[PDB]
Structures are given as structure tokens and as C-alpha cells.
Amino acid sequence: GMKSKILIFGGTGYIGNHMVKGSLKLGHPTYVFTRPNSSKTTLLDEFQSLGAIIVKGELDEHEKLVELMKKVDVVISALAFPQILDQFKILEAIKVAGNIKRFLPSDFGVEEDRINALPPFEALIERKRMIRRAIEEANIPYTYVSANCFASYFINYLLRPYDPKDEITVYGTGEAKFAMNYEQDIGLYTIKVATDPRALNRVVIYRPSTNIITQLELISRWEKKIGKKFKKIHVPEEEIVALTKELPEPENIPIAILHCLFIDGATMSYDFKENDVEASTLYPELKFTTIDELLDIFVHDPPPPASAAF
Ligand SMILES: NC(=O)c1ccc[n+]([C@@H]2O[C@H](COP(=O)([O-])OP(=O)(O)OC[C@H]3O[C@@H](n4cnc5c(N)ncnc54)[C@H](OP(=O)(O)O)[C@@H]3O)[C@@H](O)[C@H]2O)c1
């Protein structure tokens, strides 16, 4: 019907698949752009059975992108770090088509316009800033989503629930606060804000009050959930900083990110600005899965661990 048509790049991705599923769940005609050689064949079949329109192609096919843009209203990019500046190909097609009502670049993490990080990670978020600056310069309608930490991703990374070990690694003192959200909710909320007038040309942050915690508190709550105590092993901050300077790339990127998220506490080190929009306050019919509900999920049916591409 009146539902905006949504085109998602990187839809077969770790977070992208949740945006595809949320888009379809909300009744939006959904287009998924994917490479001809992608191994996500079974996932594509699932998308297809859910109503998605699969489009195979490369980002280098400018004409194809333009003709595709002319058929949709909203464009969301969930591309990975190595493809951040490749989004300029998406933006060029958007500019040529001229009918796009909203573009969401691949941010979905920290709010890069108000935080800085160590060189390895700073270089990456600067690329995301470059995309943002280009969007504004071209007057393209946008929404910048700061989804903070992907919950399943980091519960797996921090607690290694699938590991029967008696020790757990803590980064820094472990007292830095961070916010983490369930991937499925990040996906649904993202589709929602992409058509919400309240999010037009604004920064949207996912910071539900029920999802703020520290490494130490997360460990304590997990210990209570499973009835086991862990020996906490700390990795000194000065130690983490040194590694980012000596280790080769991309090996030093994960370390820099851990410092930003769990030592500097970048997702919780600022207060909201006047024009910021905190997503959990937008829809009374929805709510973000809480940390306690997440831990229960890991007790009953834990999702597999993942590792971002660098
Ligand atoms: N906040 C957090 O905790 C957190 C954690 C992880 C990631 N992130 C962010 O989430 C966003 C997406 O990350 P992700 O881990 O979901 O991405 P991903 O799964 O690694 O990749 C997304 C998609 O990119 C496409 N792709 C891969 N290589 C490509 C290439 N050479 N050329 C063109 N397309 C290519 C693939 O789709 P096809 O195979 O269909 O072509 C892939 O499924 C990024 O902005 C990332 O920084 C945030």
C-alpha cells in the first residue's frame, strides 16, 4: 500500500539480515542488493520466502544502481568496515536518481561525530564521518543511527558463554559503562526510524535504560544466571594502548575498539543533545529486549558468536 519501498545494501550481513527481517515484518516492500558470488544463498532463499526482492549485482554497476534507486524510497546501508567509502557509489546513484526520501549510512555503532578513539579505530570512524559530510553537502535526507553495542555479539565476545573456562578476561578496570542492544531490535527499530518524521535529518541513538551495564556487572549477573563463579583476569589499559601501536593491521583494530567501548566507555560518555533522538522513547508498542532477557536467551538458546570484518 502506502508503505515506503526499502532498499538494503549488505542485507545478508550480520546486522543487515535483521533489518531485512524487520522491514518485511513491518510490511515494507523490501529489496536486498547482494553480490553474484555471495555464499549467503540459503539466507537469500529465506529472505525470498519472506517476501524480499533479491537483486544481484556489484556496487560498481552505476547504471544498475540508478535504475534500482528510481524504484525505491528509502535506502539503508549495512556494509562492513572495508566497504565504508564504497558507499560513495551508493550515494552517487542516490544523487542521480533524485527520488530517495531517506538514506541511512552504515553507522550502527558509536556516535562518531562526538567521540574520538585510538588511531586504528579513529581512521575507520573518520571514513564514516566522510560519508556523513558528503550526505549533508548534497542535501540528501538522512538518519544517522548510533546503535551502540550489538548485544549477542559482545555477550559472546565478553562472556564466551560457549566456553567452559573458569576465568574471564576483563578489559581495563571493567567499571566503564556501555549500552548494548539485541540485534533483532536494532533491526526493527532501524526500519521504524527510517520512515519516522521525528528521525528525519537527525541522529538517533539506541540507549534504553534497561541496557546499560559495566563489564563487572555483566559478569556478576551471568554468574548468578548459571550458578558459576569466574576468576577475573584484567588487561591493563596501558597494555591495550601499547598493542594498538605495535600490532599490525587489522589485528590492532579490535583492540582499539575494545578500548573505546569498554575502557573509555564511549557509548555512555556523553549526554544527549537538544536534537538527538533516543529511540526507546519513540514507540509505546515496542521495547528493546533487556539485558536480563538477553542473558536468559543465552541460557536457553544462545546465538552463535561472530567476528566483524576488518
Ligand atoms: N555496534 C556494534 O557492536 C557493531 C558490531 C559489528 C558491526 N558493526 C557495524 O555494523 C555495520 C555492518 O557490519 P556487519 O558485521 O554486519 O557487516 P558484514 O556482515 O561483515 O557484511 C555485510 C555485508 O557486506 C557485503 N559485502 C562483503 N564484502 C563485500 C565487498 N567486497 N563488496 C561489496 N559488498 C560486500 C556482504 O553481502 P553480500 O555477500 O550479500 O554481497 C555482507 O553480508 C558496520 O557499519 C559495522 O561497523 C557494529
Indicate if 88 and 114 belong to the same structural domain: yes
Q: For residue 203, what is its C-alpha cell? A: 541522529
| Separation between Cα atoms, residue 265 and residue 267, nearest integer Å | 6
Resolution to one decimal, Å:
1.6
**Residues in Cβ contact with 63 at an 8 Å cutoff, skipping those fewer than 6 apart:** none
CA neighbor of 58 nearest in space, from 76, 25, 35: 35
| Separation between Cα atoms, residue 28 and residue 43, nearest integer Å | 19
Per residue, the 3-state secondary structure of the chain, as one string, reads CCCCCEEEECCCCCCHHHHHHHHHHCCCCEEEEECCCCCCHHHHHHHHHCCCEEEECCCCCHHHHHHHHCCCCEEEECCCHHHCCCHHHHHHHHHHHCCCCEEECCCCCCCCCCCCCCHHHHHHHHHHHHHHHHHHHCCCCEEEEECCEEHHHHHHHHHCCCCCCCEEEEECCCCCEEEEECHHHHHHHHHHHHHCHHHCCEEEECCCHHHEEEHHHHHHHHHHHHCCCCEEEEECHHHHHHHHHHCCCCCHHHHHHHHHHHCCCCCCCCCCCCCCEEHHHCCCCCCCCCHHHHHHHHHHCCCCCCCCCC
Indicate if 263 and 221 belong to the same structural domain: yes
Catalytic residue among 128, 177, 225, 273: 128
Domain with residue 158: its CATH number is: 3.90.25.10
Q: Is 156 in the pocket of ligand 1 (CB under 6 A)?
A: no
- Atom nearest to 38 CA in ligand 1: 39
- 199 CA distance to ligand 1 centroid (A)? 23
Indicate if 138 and 155 belong to the same structural domain: no
Q: Is 230 in the pocket of ligand 1 (CB under 6 A)?
A: no
Domain with residue 275: its CATH number is: 3.40.50.720
Q: Is 14 in the pocket of ligand 1 (CB under 6 A)?
A: yes
- 14 CA distance to ligand 1 centroid (A)? 6
Indicate if 38 and 156 belong to the same structural domain: no
- 78 CA distance to ligand 1 centroid (A)? 6
Residues making up the binding site for NADP(+): 12-15, 34-40, 81-83, 106-108, 128, 148-150
- The yes-or-no answer on residue 165 being catalytic is no
Instruction: Give the structural domain span for 132.
Output: 1-146+183-205+271-283
Indicate if 22 and 76 belong to the same structural domain: yes
Indicate if 77 and 173 belong to the same structural domain: no
Chain centroid to CA 138: how far?
24
Residues pairing with 6 in the sheet: 30, 74
| Separation between Cα atoms, residue 13 and residue 11, nearest integer Å | 5
Indicate if 85 and 12 belong to the same structural domain: yes
- 15 CA distance to ligand 1 centroid (A)? 7
**Residues in Cβ contact with 129 at an 8 Å cutoff, skipping those fewer than 6 apart:** 112, 113
Indicate if 173 and 303 belong to the same structural domain: yes
First-last CA distance in the chain: 40
Q: For residue 155, what is its C-alpha cell? A: 555477550
How distant, in Å, are the alpha carbons of 16, 129, 201, 214, 286 from that of 135?
21, 10, 10, 35, 30
Number of domains in the chain: 2
Q: Obtained via which technique?
A: X-ray
Indicate if 102 and 39 belong to the same structural domain: yes
Q: Is 83 in the pocket of ligand 1 (CB under 6 A)?
A: yes
Indicate if 225 and 129 belong to the same structural domain: no
CA neighbor of 310 nearest in space, from 109, 112, 107, 80: 80
| Separation between Cα atoms, residue 120 and residue 106, nearest integer Å | 18
Indicate if 261 and 279 belong to the same structural domain: no
Indicate if 265 and 275 belong to the same structural domain: no
CB atoms within 10 A of CB 105: 26
